[PDB]
Amino acid sequence: PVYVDIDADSAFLKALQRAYPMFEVEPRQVTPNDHANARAFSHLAIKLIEQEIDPDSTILDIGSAPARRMMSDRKYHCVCPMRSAEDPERLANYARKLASAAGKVLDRNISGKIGDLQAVMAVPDTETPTFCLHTDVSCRQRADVAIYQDVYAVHAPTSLYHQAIKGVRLAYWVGFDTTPFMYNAMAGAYPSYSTNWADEQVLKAKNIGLCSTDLTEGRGKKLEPCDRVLFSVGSTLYPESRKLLKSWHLPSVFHLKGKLSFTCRCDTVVSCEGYVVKRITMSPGLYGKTTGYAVTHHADGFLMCKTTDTVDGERVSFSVCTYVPATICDQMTGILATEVTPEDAQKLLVGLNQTNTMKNYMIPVVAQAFSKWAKECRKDMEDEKLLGVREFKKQKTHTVYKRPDTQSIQKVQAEFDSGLSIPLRTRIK
Amino acid sequence: PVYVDIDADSAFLKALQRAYPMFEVEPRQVTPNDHANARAFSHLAIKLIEQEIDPDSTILDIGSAPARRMMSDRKYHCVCPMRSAEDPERLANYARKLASAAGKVLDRNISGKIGDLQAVMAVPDTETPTFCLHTDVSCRQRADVAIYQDVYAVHAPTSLYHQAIKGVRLAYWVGFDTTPFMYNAMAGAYPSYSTNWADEQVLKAKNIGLCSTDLTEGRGKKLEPCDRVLFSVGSTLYPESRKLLKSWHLPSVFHLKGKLSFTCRCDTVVSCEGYVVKRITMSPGLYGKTTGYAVTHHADGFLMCKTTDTVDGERVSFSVCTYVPATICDQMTGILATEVTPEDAQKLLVGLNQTNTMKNYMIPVVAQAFSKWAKECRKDMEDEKLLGVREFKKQKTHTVYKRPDTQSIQKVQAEFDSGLSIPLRTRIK
Amino acid sequence: PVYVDIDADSAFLKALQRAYPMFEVEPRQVTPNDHANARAFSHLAIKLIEQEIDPDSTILDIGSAPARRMMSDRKYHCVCPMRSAEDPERLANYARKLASAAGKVLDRNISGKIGDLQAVMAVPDTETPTFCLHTDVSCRQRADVAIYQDVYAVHAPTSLYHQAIKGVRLAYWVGFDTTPFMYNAMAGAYPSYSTNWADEQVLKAKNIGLCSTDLTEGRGKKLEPCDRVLFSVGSTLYPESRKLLKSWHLPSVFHLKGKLSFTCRCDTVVSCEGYVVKRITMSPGLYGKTTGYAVTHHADGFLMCKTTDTVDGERVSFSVCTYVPATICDQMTGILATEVTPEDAQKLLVGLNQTNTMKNYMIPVVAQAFSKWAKECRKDMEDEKLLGVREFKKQKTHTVYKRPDTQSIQKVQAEFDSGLSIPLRTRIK
Ligand SMILES: Cn1cnc2nc(N)[nH]c(=O)c21
Ligand SMILES: Cn1cnc2nc(N)[nH]c(=O)c21
Ligand SMILES: Cn1cnc2nc(N)[nH]c(=O)c21
Ligand SMILES: [Zn+2]
Ligand SMILES: [Zn+2]
Ligand SMILES: [Zn+2]
């Protein structure tokens, strides 16, 4: 029996049910209609992690949202480095929320939280059990299992290492699937969590879901993905790094070799329409040979196609990715058996949609990806070379369609070897 | 449970429900049928702001309409600079309304309001809690959260700065969406709040929704948008400034650096068919790096196309924008998959309309924008360049269609560094 | 609850309901079937004005029809200059009506009216509260709010100024919409109040609704509108002046600068099928900058097309205007999307009519206006110039169609700086 914050008529409830077999999920929607999907996925991941941990084990909360942790009765040590502009806001409401609970209930250890916050305010560098002002690298509190949450800005090996040296044997990471960044897409969408993202070099493109072009009258030759990308989660902007996103795409077995050596395993437990819940087990010593392979089981179709656009009025081509639902791929099997036009594929996609199962601003590019993939497949079956010999004249590859129940294999690296302001601190009190 | 002033058969009630999930909105219409949409949106925004503020916190009302504030029991400090010709009219009824309530009820602090008004009349420069005669820049009363309302004539950074120096940590801004002015449109419409607007250089055009041409017999070369634009809200005229409209389109994080330094965040909370409710948090100090990006989540389609018209009998071309409803875009997905004529697109739009969901005087231009966008998309997919290289021969870009659930991203600036007349004063008493 | 003098099967009852949302209007017809529309509109305007004024405020009645004012219990000061041939007739019945009420009821201040009339008869230049014999310019009685009624022969700025100097702060003006004269139409119709009008230069035309040609056997080169125009309201004739009709089309804000300076705002409150109820607020001093713009919100379609006729047997071309109903424009949206012949447009208009919604003698010209507008729109969409540049070869403009919910903007001027005969006087007694 699990309760979600989505109306029962939404397809994402079915998606969550599929992605969380161990839980019976039923709708409960009151307030939200935009960020309900991400909130529900995060809540279900938190519940699954809680059910699969020792109730008497101290757990870090690197993905610190202390306002959220008000009902969790487990030993939570939130870590709020105070790095962004928003962190104080959260802090503020958290304090207010504590005050709101300071005289209502006595079951969630309100006095402990308030005292810990007061101690932190008196001295920022306190190591109180349920709060701190240090980065996960610089944190000092010792726990057993550490859980991350929407952390796409920290090198995964380094944070995991500095958590292991603090006795962290298990870690979880709820976030966005990192497949689009291992495939090096310029732009992409997660059109069920209301998120788009684009490389800063395509922000002035016309058709992608995160751009703003100019109505011009018309008139460096190397466009490649750069480290800086932008994530529009609904109306919120997040500047993220490609290299620190292609860092939580950890191989199945990887070694952290330094002063303390460890062998660790990452296994993606939950996967839903773009979100993933990775689990990394950390243990000292070397426990085998690292294959250096990261495996992504595509529970639903993953398309990545090279679309042509116009950036700053200049015609260019770049790659955009999306996560098609599994049912769409299943029902498009037969059509994709034939060479299908982008227009006809778009019409069939609209018909299959119907409410909708896939957002319509993606259909125009999903259809083009399907058509390019079908044409490439036919051109493949229309020419056959000699078996056993790699006969090189490298040719075009303008689509990557990972249908449901397929797997992606990437060779990755497997061997790795105090800001709070005085006025703000005064105000928070 | 929320009550609106619109008949239950109007689509705008559904639009409001979509734009205000946190409230259960039900129709209640007696008097209005023209300005019901804007009034309902403003009332819902006011209710949402009230529910999300400290009940014991003094709040400014820069968008001063003191006649309205007769039921708000919160600490309201209306600011009436007395700058426009209509300001006295409001004042008059305000006073009358106070007199109307001077001997009816004793729950809304009528005596306080009357005494404050008398003190203001005795001396204009009084700093009474619930009234003043100073501009927001020149106001002296100190509060916690400041609310704006239909303020499209004051530089947002300067007003926010002068409110922060007065201890304003939070501010709200209910108004018209500023996307059409970030895209630099010559003319545009908000065809659900009965508003049109045009640049003074196109006021003598033929087909736009705010113009008046002449039946002539026929017979500088640079037309670009200028600062002065005109808003026809129903039958009321408002001369606004482009630069002071492209000033409340604030980035997500912006710094106000002066004698007191602040870092602030603007996040659009509510968005309905053209109206927006922005929220800016003001705080001293610098709390990160400003990315200099403003993000607009297009909950409903936004079209901006270059139409050809005749101004003063001379053929010209200029850009006009509109906000198509989401359902129209959804149902036009498939058709836009194909090259569709403006005539056939217009016929399909009329059929989709049916009462109506979109006003028909816009359909003739919505269809042309749709057709131009479809043709540009096809011409894009009909030519493909080399990936990875910016091969510049800048070409035509004659449409900007931001479908529902897409995002616009504009690089904006993120680092910023006594009139009352004696006869009127005598009469008001 | 409001009661009108029109049968419930008439479309004008629906038009009135639309134009008067604040009132619940129900039919009550006994006597009239021709002038019911104008009488109902005037009565509703009078009721709305009464409900929105101080009950204890003296009000002028420049549009003096004292016979009508027998039930109005408010302080009415009718002004009858005695300028036309009809004024005595009215006077006569007025006196008779007073006598008819002289011994029936004692609630409407009949004795006061009779005494005032007797005092006026004894001395014409009396300033009695409820009667006078002076023009609004020459009137001496002092009031607060002045109401006009069907006054299309007096310069609006001068009358308003001479009323302000007499302490007139508010004024109303119920009359015919002045849009056809700001667009400078030669002839026009109000085919819901049974009114036509023509310029004296087209009174001998064939097809317009106010003309009389001659069955001739056949055989100055500048036809432009002149000041003198003729209004046929049903069977009654009214010689009006263009310049004094293009004088109550007041801008939104205008300044009356003389011995006493004032800033004033005119806002059209009610608008129905051609009639309007303008409201002008007059106040001393200067309260802003006058933009010099008059805004007309076209709640229903306004057509003005150049038709070719024969005047005195000579072929000429001149412009005629009309007010199409909103529903006709709505249902013609799709057809106007296509190039439509005047004949086929006429057939569709007849089918849409059906009783009728628009009088059929106008359909022949409404259809031609629609067809010319559609052809001009297509020729516009069939040629596109360079954006941003006014490329002048002034070309044809043979139609002006202001669809419902559009706005007309005209640059107007915003800065302005004893006949009774002895025999008649003896007879009236
Ligand atoms: C904290 N957070 C929640 N959703 C997020 N999405 C991205 N791309 N980066 C973030 O830091 C983030
Ligand atoms: C005060 N107000 C209400 N709607 C408004 N619309 C514009 N454009 N400018 C304004 O000042 C305004
Ligand atoms: C007094 N009156 C009633 N309907 C009227 N119509 C016109 N054109 N001129 C008038 O003076 C008039
Ligand atoms: Zn710690
Ligand atoms: Zn103040
Ligand atoms: Zn008088």
Numbering used by the authors:
A (entry chain C), B (entry chain B), C (entry chain A): 3 to 221, 230 to 364, 376 to 412, 423 to 448, 458 to 469
Mind quoting what the paper says about this structure?
NsP1 is the membrane anchor for the complex, forming dodecameric pores that associate monotopically with the membrane in the necks of the spherules to gate their entrance. Enzymatically, nsP1 also has a role in addition of cap0 structures to the 5′ end of the positive-sense viral RNAs. NsP1 possesses both N′7 methyltransferase and guanylyltransferase activity and reverses the order of these reactions. Each nsP1 protomer is built around a methyltransferase fold common to SAM-dependent methyltransferases with additional insertions (membrane binding and oligomerisation (MBO) loops 1 and 2) and extensions (ring aperture membrane binding oligomerisation (RAMBO) domain) that contribute to pore formation, oligomerization, and membrane binding.
In order to investigate the structure of the pores after the capping/decapping reaction, we analyzed by cryo-EM the structure of nsP1 pores incubated with a cap0 11-nucleotide-long CHIKV RNA. However, after the decapping reaction, we could distinguish two different three-dimensional (3D) classes; one similar to the previous structures and a second with significant changes in the first 130 residues and the C-terminal alpha helix k of nsP1. Electron density for the m7GMP base was found in the GTP binding site in both classes. The nsP1 protomers appear tilted outward 8° with respect to the equatorial axis of the ring. The pore opening results on an increase of the inner aperture of 3 Å (from 70 to 73 Å) and the outer diameter of 12 Å (from 178 Å to 190 Å) and a change in the surface charge distribution concomitant with a projection of the active site toward the top of the ring. This conformation resembles the structure of nsP1 pores when expressed in mammalian cells (Discussion) (13), and was not observed in datasets of m7GMP–nsP1 produced following incubation of the substrates and uncapped RNA. Thus, we can conclude that the decapping reaction induces a motion in the ring resulting in an opening of the pore aperture. Here, we show how the postdecapping state induces motions that trigger an opening in the pore, similar to the open form of nsP1 complexes expressed in mammalian cells. This open form increases surface exposure of the RNA binding pockets, with a concomitant redistribution of surface charges along a path leading to the internal pore.
